[PDB]
Design a protein around this motif. Sequence first.
Motif, PDB file in Angstrom:
ATOM      1  N   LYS A   1       0.823  -1.211   0.000  1.00 33.53           N
ATOM      2  CA  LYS A   1       0.000   0.000   0.000  1.00 33.53           C
ATOM      3  C   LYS A   1       0.860   1.265   0.000  1.00 33.53           C
ATOM      4  O   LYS A   1       0.583   2.200  -0.743  1.00 33.53           O
ATOM      5  CB  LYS A   1      -0.970   0.015   1.185  1.00 33.53           C
ATOM      6  N   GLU A   2       1.896   1.271   0.840  1.00 36.69           N
ATOM      7  CA  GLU A   2       2.798   2.407   1.001  1.00 36.69           C
ATOM      8  C   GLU A   2       4.241   1.914   0.877  1.00 36.69           C
ATOM      9  O   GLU A   2       4.927   1.748   1.886  1.00 36.69           O
ATOM     10  CB  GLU A   2       2.605   3.047   2.380  1.00 36.69           C
TER      11      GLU A   2
ATOM     12  N   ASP B   1       8.835 -10.630  -4.346  1.00 37.78           N
ATOM     13  CA  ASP B   1       8.256  -9.339  -4.675  1.00 37.78           C
ATOM     14  C   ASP B   1       9.353  -8.267  -4.640  1.00 37.78           C
ATOM     15  O   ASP B   1       9.951  -8.014  -3.583  1.00 37.78           O
ATOM     16  CB  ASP B   1       7.109  -9.002  -3.717  1.00 37.78           C
ATOM     17  N   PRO B   2       9.629  -7.643  -5.804  1.00 33.94           N
ATOM     18  CA  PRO B   2      10.707  -6.655  -5.933  1.00 33.94           C
ATOM     19  C   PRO B   2      10.476  -5.430  -5.053  1.00 33.94           C
ATOM     20  O   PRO B   2      11.428  -4.843  -4.550  1.00 33.94           O
ATOM     21  CB  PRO B   2      10.657  -6.260  -7.413  1.00 33.94           C
ATOM     22  N   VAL B   3       9.212  -5.072  -4.852  1.00 29.63           N
ATOM     23  CA  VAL B   3       8.852  -3.901  -4.059  1.00 29.63           C
ATOM     24  C   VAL B   3       9.127  -4.106  -2.565  1.00 29.63           C
ATOM     25  O   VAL B   3       9.442  -3.152  -1.849  1.00 29.63           O
ATOM     26  CB  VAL B   3       7.389  -3.487  -4.331  1.00 29.63           C
TER      27      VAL B   3
ATOM     28  N   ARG C   1      13.079  -6.134   3.214  1.00 30.45           N
ATOM     29  CA  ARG C   1      12.301  -5.648   4.355  1.00 30.45           C
ATOM     30  C   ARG C   1      11.434  -6.722   5.032  1.00 30.45           C
ATOM     31  O   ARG C   1      11.149  -6.632   6.227  1.00 30.45           O
ATOM     32  CB  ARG C   1      11.452  -4.449   3.948  1.00 30.45           C
ATOM     33  N   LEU C   2      11.021  -7.730   4.268  1.00 30.44           N
ATOM     34  CA  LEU C   2      10.225  -8.823   4.815  1.00 30.44           C
ATOM     35  C   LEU C   2      10.578 -10.127   4.112  1.00 30.44           C
ATOM     36  O   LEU C   2      10.604 -10.192   2.881  1.00 30.44           O
ATOM     37  CB  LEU C   2       8.731  -8.508   4.686  1.00 30.44           C
ATOM     38  N   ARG C   3      10.894 -11.148   4.903  1.00 32.14           N
ATOM     39  CA  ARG C   3      11.163 -12.489   4.375  1.00 32.14           C
ATOM     40  C   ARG C   3      10.438 -13.506   5.234  1.00 32.14           C
ATOM     41  O   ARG C   3      10.394 -13.370   6.458  1.00 32.14           O
ATOM     42  CB  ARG C   3      12.659 -12.812   4.377  1.00 32.14           C
TER      43      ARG C   3
END
Lengths: 810, 810
Positions: A566-567, A607-609, A613-615
């Motif tokens: 979303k952001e 996800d490239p975006v 930051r999250l795995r």
Amino acid sequence: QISVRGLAGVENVTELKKNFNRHLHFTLVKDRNVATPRDYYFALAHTVRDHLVGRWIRTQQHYYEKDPKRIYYLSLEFYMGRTLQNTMVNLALENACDEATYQLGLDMEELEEIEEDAGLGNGGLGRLAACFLDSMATLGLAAYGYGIRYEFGIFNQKICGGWQMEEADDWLRYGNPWEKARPEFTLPVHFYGRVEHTSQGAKWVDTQVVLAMPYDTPVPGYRNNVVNTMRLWSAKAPNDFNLGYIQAVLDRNLAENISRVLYPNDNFFEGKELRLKQEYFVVAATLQDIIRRFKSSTNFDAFPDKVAIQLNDTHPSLAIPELMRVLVDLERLDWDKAWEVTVKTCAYTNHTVLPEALERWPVHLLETLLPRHLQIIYEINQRFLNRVAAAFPGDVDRLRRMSLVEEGAVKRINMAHLCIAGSHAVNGVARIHSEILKKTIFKDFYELEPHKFQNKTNGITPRRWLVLCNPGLAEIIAERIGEEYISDLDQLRKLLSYVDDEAFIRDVAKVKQENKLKFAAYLEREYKVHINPNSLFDVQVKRIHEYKRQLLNCLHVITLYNRIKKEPNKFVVPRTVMIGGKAAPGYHMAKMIIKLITAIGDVVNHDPVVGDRLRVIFLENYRVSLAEKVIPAADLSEQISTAGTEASGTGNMKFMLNGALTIGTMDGANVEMAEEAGEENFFIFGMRVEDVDRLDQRGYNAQEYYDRIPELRQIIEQLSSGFFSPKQPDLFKDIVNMLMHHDRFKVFADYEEYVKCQERVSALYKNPREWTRMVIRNIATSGKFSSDRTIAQYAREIWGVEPSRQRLPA
Amino acid sequence: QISVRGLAGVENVTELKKNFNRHLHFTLVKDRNVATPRDYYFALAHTVRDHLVGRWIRTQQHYYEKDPKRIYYLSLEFYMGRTLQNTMVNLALENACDEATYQLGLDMEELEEIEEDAGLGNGGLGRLAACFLDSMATLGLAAYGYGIRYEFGIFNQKICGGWQMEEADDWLRYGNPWEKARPEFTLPVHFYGRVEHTSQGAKWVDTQVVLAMPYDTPVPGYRNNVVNTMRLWSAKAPNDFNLGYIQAVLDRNLAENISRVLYPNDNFFEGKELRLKQEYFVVAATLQDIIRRFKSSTNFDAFPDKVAIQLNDTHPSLAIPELMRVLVDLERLDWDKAWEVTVKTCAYTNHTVLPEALERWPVHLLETLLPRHLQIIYEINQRFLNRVAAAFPGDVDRLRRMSLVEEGAVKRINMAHLCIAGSHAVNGVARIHSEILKKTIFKDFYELEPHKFQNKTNGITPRRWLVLCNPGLAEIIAERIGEEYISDLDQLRKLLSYVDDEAFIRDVAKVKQENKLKFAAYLEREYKVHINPNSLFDVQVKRIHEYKRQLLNCLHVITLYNRIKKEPNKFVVPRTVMIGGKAAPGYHMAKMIIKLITAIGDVVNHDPVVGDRLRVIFLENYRVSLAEKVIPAADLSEQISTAGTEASGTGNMKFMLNGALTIGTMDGANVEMAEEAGEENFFIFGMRVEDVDRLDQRGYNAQEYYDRIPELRQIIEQLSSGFFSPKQPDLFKDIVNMLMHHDRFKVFADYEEYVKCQERVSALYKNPREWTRMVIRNIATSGKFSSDRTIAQYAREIWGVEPSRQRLPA
Ligand SMILES: OC[C@H]1O[C@@H](NC(=S)N/N=C/c2ccccc2O)[C@H](O)[C@@H](O)[C@@H]1O
Ligand SMILES: OC[C@H]1O[C@@H](NC(=S)N/N=C/c2ccccc2O)[C@H](O)[C@@H](O)[C@@H]1O
Ligand SMILES: OC[C@H]1O[C@@H](NC(=S)N/N=C/c2ccccc2O)[C@H](O)[C@@H](O)[C@@H]1O
Ligand SMILES: OC[C@H]1O[C@@H](NC(=S)N/N=C/c2ccccc2O)[C@H](O)[C@@H](O)[C@@H]1O
């Protein structure tokens, strides 16, 4: 290198080196030119094992001369893990062996990885038995663990296409250097047959005989020179068994199948004949061994002064009617006296309130397999119900609720009721669990016999779970407060005076980063996966079960992913979310949950975006040896069972000891942990037991949550529409259906508080100094959760024996 | 005590004693206060075993550096017996260990009785493989025995009510100290599947995989410091096998059943799938191991210069199509070159002419289990029959007789024909047997390829069969001629110059009386039976089979009994008639023969008129360890097979070596024994092969003998009427019926000559001096029957290797 690992003296190093070569040559028949890595492990195990023998022989000789009260811990599960490192730690040999092998040109850490786990349990119950054994030895108790030598332990888990696959754990394939067969103590165990009545007593006749052959494994105490015994029974056919000829020999396999494989049911209950056979087999062999040792010390009056039998759940509940059988049928004691002896001898520990887990054996099975035991159970029940009837006259429904015999479609025996009736002590495994026992499922029994009901809050051994797996943390603690805390864990309280200590804060944070780098490396080598070691390590490791709510964790993970999408250009605290655990092979919903985790990972991790930051990682083949690696690396411990469902938990205690903060519900031992550490130093969220009760009375409507939380609605819609399974759009329809219409564990009801609480976790992680101070406050108050404390309470309050921290002569 | 047992030096005795205590402590975890007799055996076995390791490692290293031609002896049977004493004898440790244990307060002889026989064979074929292994080591040959590690060897025999009962021989129950597992050499073996054809070659696909795990046992040479390897394969399931869950794990037993049990068929043939699987399993694993060692030394041209494979009967005949399969399908050699290599590599030893024993595998079995092997066999056969057709044009019946494929109700593969076609050498096992092969059953093959056919007369190892079992005789021989005869048995000829030696005669007679007293004692203790040790010990020990004619022996025994009953007050030479042997469990007539022997004993042994003049004893559980006790005690060796039926015999050679005289037919090796000793020094009776042929042409009519021999008529009438079975008058009607109407082995035809010859035996026994001189003449000429001679002939004439008696460095 590090001090808590002991001395590397010139003499000892020299001597270990020559014994290593001697074993490589004489034992393994190799030289340095043809020796395999496994030969080297075996040479090292033989070298270390040699140091056990003197202490083992003198410990057991000491019990013979002093004749103390003996503790018999009966369990169908002993989840031991690896033995090599634990033996070195407890014998103070670790640094010496490290030096010796280094000089021989070998890495000891590498040799250690060769050893198979003894995977002779499923989870918390099995591991508890192992921690208890370590503590009983450390506390100088004359204790014996009795169980079954399974040929196959808990299956190795492989993940294929995101699905769990099971493979046989053939852990004895290359031989177990840690066991000594005791053929002289081979004992007959009887099955089937019929009961005959004669002039003086009943007789059990026309039985089939299976032999029980014991193998002894040493259990060393921590540097007290005590070595206790774990004795595990193996099934063997007698030689005339079925004795056309070829078939008769091949059919020996049938008898020996009793000890072939550990049932992986996890919590729940399958009334399978083979499981019943395993339960009797361990009980019958163990009781003969106990009685033999007792006679070798007619007067069974003194039996309870010289013997305690602890029943680890109802699995060995047949010890009660078996003891009666031996006392009444063989020794010719009268009923009432035999019963007195039995009750004073036996104690029962409950490890669950989940109704589907409780053992309720069909009468027709016991009738065929154990006819005399059934008659004894019926008699026990008749005498017990007469006691109930005299105490509560006219209360006819109490009589049917308290019966050991359950009426219905098929008659069954409630083994938990059998255990309470025939034990002098019944305990739960955390304060809230024990309260629930008195207030709800065993309420009638509590009212009849309140003195029976106790609490013994679970614990873990600080030897395996701190010194062995986290030497760097043990060391920085030992630098400030000395080494005595390793067998007196309350001494960790002294660390409260270092919470503002700039040097100590930096060290605690250093040790953690070091453990995280090491584990980020292990993930790379053995599994070829990339992770950011600067991220927060968010871990939930434990068996897969709806009540443990890995699903709630999944929901949080998806929420984070959707918030990032979303952001994208907003800052988020990076996380590595690690979930691991095996599912019972017959447990469909748990297998689906595993698939969900892997499917979420497939989407999130590519996800490239999202970036680094999250795995989301599924930790394959979670087992004791993997726990020793992941727990020291963790920052956040997920303990998020629906309040009232996790009896205690013990993984929670392992994470607390090793410098992770805990996000959890007020369930099991979490309550006492938050109590010890202070609520400000714990991330508590969600419904308490009372709130769950309130909701059950009203009726849990998952729709209400779906209707009122837009972020939750999006997740359910993503799941339903095939966002996480594009080629199989409906793959997760069983999951959505259960959450929406049949969720016993109220996943949606705790969702909002969980996400909120998780935001607070992220907030604190952004400030390393304050994160670490809260960690120190956790480590510092973790002392209560030592199994030394737990065992000292069993000993004083149930077994009637005094623990001793005094050394035996070396 | 006695010299041939080696030195008991102060250093060695001291060192053995401390190693014994070290093993008792560190290995067995015992002290002198709780040690069982079995702990003591195991401590001694570990102490002795330690002395093998240096020599074992250097022998195998030596073969690696020198790279000699390797001999692979393939057998489904290795009848090893006990290992402890043999190891001490060959290492010259026996006196030292005797002294060491005596000083420790233990009787070594008692400890030796604790060891289980490795009973991994049925009889002569299995035992031959064991003697061969000993000789190959003693002769410095780079030899490997390959077979199967059966979990259960030959059944232990119990006699219940005079009937054989079988019990499982769980010989590995307590662990085998003499084996070293070699997990690094675990190999996959394939079963079932189907054959696919591609652009370049056939492929064997969709197979089921069973793993082969090798265990190495040392084979020490006699005091030459050589230690060769016997490698036995064990079956293990792969870990994903069948991988509801519980069943899948339990079903692993199916795969592992391959190595579970030795087939006890004795001579004959059961086309059972499991037996086929065992045969392929040993062959497939062994060949991969051979090729691996060969590559570690592309150029398969040199394969036959570096490898010999000896096929011990047809049991491992699948080595021929398996070698072709690997060469053609995997290595991509062309057929003709692969075939060249195969023929030059493989040699075949036949061990029987009994048609019912020959392996003829149904085509449909090979089709399902080994589809690619069937295709290879068909091709072999087509190419071979084209060779036959070119050599014998127009001879259409020769083509069908020589075919590997037998036509009929079910198509079968004649494995013996497969072996001859694909081997460079075919040998029988005694001169008369090898002649019979050329003249009768393999006559067509001899005419095609006469150069293939050889004789290699069997032998026995003078280490186990003289030094170990009869140290007293070995010693009195060593006193006169030195010790070199133990590995050069022809030197016994020097004893001919002592045949008139008064001192030597007395010693030979003394040793025998001593052995007889010892065995009369063993019979008392372990079996509570009374025997007169001054009687003639008349023994027939060997597997029970009609062709071996235990029945003819029974007839003699009854004749003696009837003669005593006729004239009670006449002098007869007292006899103790001992018959022992196991019967194949499915062999009804053999089981009846055992019952007959015991029933005769019941009558004879309790007749007051007979007294100590005649006793009939069935020796229960005949096996290698019992042979070592009974053979030295024997005066008379019964070797009474119908001429033409015993390929060689080897028990005959063991009795000759140990001072018994032989009553026998001109059959098997008996012919060469009588040839060596002189016919005057042998009790030869009965039909020769030619007389049996003459009778077959006429038609054997047993009635004629019954009609003309009154003493025989009385026996048959006693048997028929229930004289030997009063409560079951018709018990032995199968026996009478067979003898009268369906006797393939012509028991009645040799009866008169047998009884007459037996009278001459009694006559000679009445004169001790002349009995003993004839014995000396037997011992003195027994040298040819050393398996050292046999192996030297295999090596020079088949394998193309020179034996060496030179020591390796210690
Ligand atoms: O080595 C593999 C074999 O080892 C044997 N163990 C022996 S002979 N001695 N063990 C001594 C010992 C000595 C100290 C501590 C633990 C021990 O098992 C075990 O009895 C056997 O089951 C296992 O397969
Ligand atoms: O007290 C130690 C632990 O015991 C566990 N209970 C278990 S692991 N029960 N397992 C029952 C079981 C029953 C049948 C077959 C396999 C099984 O693991 C509890 O769930 C846990 O809260 C507690 O900390
Ligand atoms: O002791 C019982 C166990 O012994 C092991 N043997 C070992 S660990 N070493 N063996 C060394 C050895 C050394 C010299 C000669 C023969 C030998 O087996 C075997 O591998 C195992 O199968 C068996 O059950
Ligand atoms: O050459 C050594 C000896 O071989 C024996 N032959 C045997 S013991 N054959 N056994 C065949 C057999 C075939 C299937 C199953 C079990 C078996 O023992 C011969 O009968 C004997 O004359 C000879 O001395």
